[PDB]
């Protein structure tokens, strides 16, 4: 509306894009996933752009085999000022697009499952700009549905003190009508979650499994990176000797960049003087690798594994 209105609102571009997008996706779920679609195919620089009846009538398979053949250095590669800020952007707007969508949409059983299908389509393809853009998008996404995971959690604790407030309160009684709503709320809440829990699943299987040992080293580190903020984020879920595994056996991987994102990971983890316990497993499977590499090759490789052994050391 006036100046006064906007400025006092500082809606982004993005937040801006993707509230317009929430209410085209109300109108018309399909124009709307076609235009996430055409997006996620735009921003691998593909030249081509899907179409309703390709939407409608075409597996996500066949809608990737014939955007690959209108390829022409794609968005995330590129140098130049006009393309500095694009990997921060592409990376926020997946977190602006499901922060907006956590209460509602997220849990519709369409618009996750078009968006998962269709980037771990594009992990699978032989075209880097694919393989690269994709693999960002579904490790920026589970971080967006694990924050959806912690907002949950946090009402399924008000949910659980809540009804216990009650439960307590009757005892001998007939089970009233807040103690019903609460009890559904409660499976609600629950059935919320194990829903993230799936989509977090389809992303680590179909993706990041696939991803973390991809031949482009780049790939590589954008998972280890991120499943470093997993495990910190979500230590229950995430943070298990089958997870840190990945982690433990790309200690061994060959380029500096790389092996500098497992130590970055493995430094966040131990700082935190209370899932240290949890590392115990680890630290006795894989010190010998860690303890090798504080005379790395690579000095600022080493310079991290030096102090993750100091940090171990401390505990």
Same mark, same amino acid.
């Given at each position: 509306?006036?100046?006064?209105?906007?400025?006092?609102?500082?809606?982004?571009?993005?937040?801006?894009?993707?509230?317009?997008?929430? $209410?085209?996706?109300?109108?018309?779920?399909?124009?709307?996933?076609?235009?996430?679609?055409?997006? +996620?195919?735009?921003?691998?620089?593909?030249?081509?752009?899907?179409?309703?009846?390709? +939407?409608?009538?075409? &597996?996500?398979? $066949?809608?990737?085999?014939?955007?690959?053949?209108?390829?022409?250095?794609?968005?995330?590669?590129?140098?130049?000022? &006009?393309?500095?800020? +694009?990997?921060?952007?592409?990376?926020?707007?997946?977190?602006?697009?499901?922060?907006?969508?956590?209460?509602?949409?997220?849990?519709?059983?369409?618009?996750?499952?078009?968006?998962?299908?269709?980037?771990?389509?594009?992990?699978?393809?032989?075209?880097?700009?694919?393989?690269?853009?994709?693999?960002?998008?579904?490790?920026?996404?589970?971080?967006?549905?694990?924050?959806?995971?912690?907002?949950?959690?946090?009402?399924?604790?008000?949910? &659980?003190?809540?009804?216990?407030? $009650?439960?307590?309160?009757?005892?001998?009684?007939?089970?009233?009508?807040? *103690?019903? /709503? /609460?009890?559904?709320?409660?499976?609600?809440? &629950?059935?919320?979650?194990?829903?993230?829990?799936?989509?977090?699943?389809?992303?680590?299987?179909?993706?990041?499994?696939?991803?973390?040992?991809?031949?482009?080293?780049?790939?590589?580190?954008?998972?280890?990176?991120?499943?470093?903020?997993?495990?910190?984020?979500?230590?229950?879920?995430?943070?298990?000797?089958?997870?840190?595994?990945?982690?433990?056996?790309?200690?061994?991987?060959?380029?500096?960049?790389?092996?500098?994102?497992?130590?970055?990971? /493995?430094?966040? /983890?131990?700082?935190?003087?209370?899932? +240290?316990?949890?590392?115990?497993?680890?630290?006795?499977?894989?010190?010998?690798?860690?303890?090798?590499?504080?005379?790395?090759?690579?000095?600022?490789?080493?310079?991290?594994?030096?102090?993750?052994?100091? *940090?171990?050391?401390?505990?």
């Amino acid at each position: 509306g006036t100046l006064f209105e906007v400025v006092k609102l500082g809606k982004s571009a993005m937040q801006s894009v993707v509230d317009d997008w929430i $209410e085209s996706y109300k109108q018309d779920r399909d124009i709307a996933l076609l235009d996430l679609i055409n997006f +996620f195919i735009q921003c691998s620089g593909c030249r081509g752009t899907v179409r309703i009846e390709m +939407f409608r009538n075409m &597996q996500n398979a $066949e809608i990737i085999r014939k955007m690959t053949e209108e390829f022409d250095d794609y968005p995330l590669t590129m140098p130049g000022p &006009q393309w500095k800020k +694009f990997r921060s952007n592409f990376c926020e707007f997946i977190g602006v697009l499901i922060r907006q969508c956590q209460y509602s949409i997220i849990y519709d059983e369409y618009m996750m499952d078009t968006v998962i299908s269709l980037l771990t389509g594009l992990s699978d393809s032989q075209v880097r700009a694919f393989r690269h853009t994709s693999t960002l998008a579904a490790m920026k996404l589970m971080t967006a549905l694990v924050n959806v995971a912690l907002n949950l959690s946090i009402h399924q604790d008000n949910t &659980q003190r809540q009804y216990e407030a $009650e439960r307590n309160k009757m005892i001998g009684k007939r089970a009233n009508e807040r *103690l019903e /709503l /609460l009890l559904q709320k409660r499976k609600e809440l &629950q059935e919320n979650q194990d829903e993230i829990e799936n989509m977090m699943n389809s992303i680590f299987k179909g993706i990041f499994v696939h991803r973390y040992r991809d031949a482009i080293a780049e790939i590589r580190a954008i998972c280890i990176e991120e499943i470093g903020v997993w495990m910190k984020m979500y230590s229950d879920a995430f943070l298990n000797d089958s997870y840190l595994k990945y982690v433990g056996w790309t200690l061994h991987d060959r380029q500096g960049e790389v092996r500098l994102k497992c130590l970055k990971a /493995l430094q966040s /983890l131990y700082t935190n003087r209370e899932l +240290f316990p949890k590392l115990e497993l680890f630290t006795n499977r894989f010190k010998d690798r860690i303890v090798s590499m504080t005379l790395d090759k690579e000095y600022d490789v080493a310079v991290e594994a030096i102090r993750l052994v100091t *940090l171990i050391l401390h505990g």
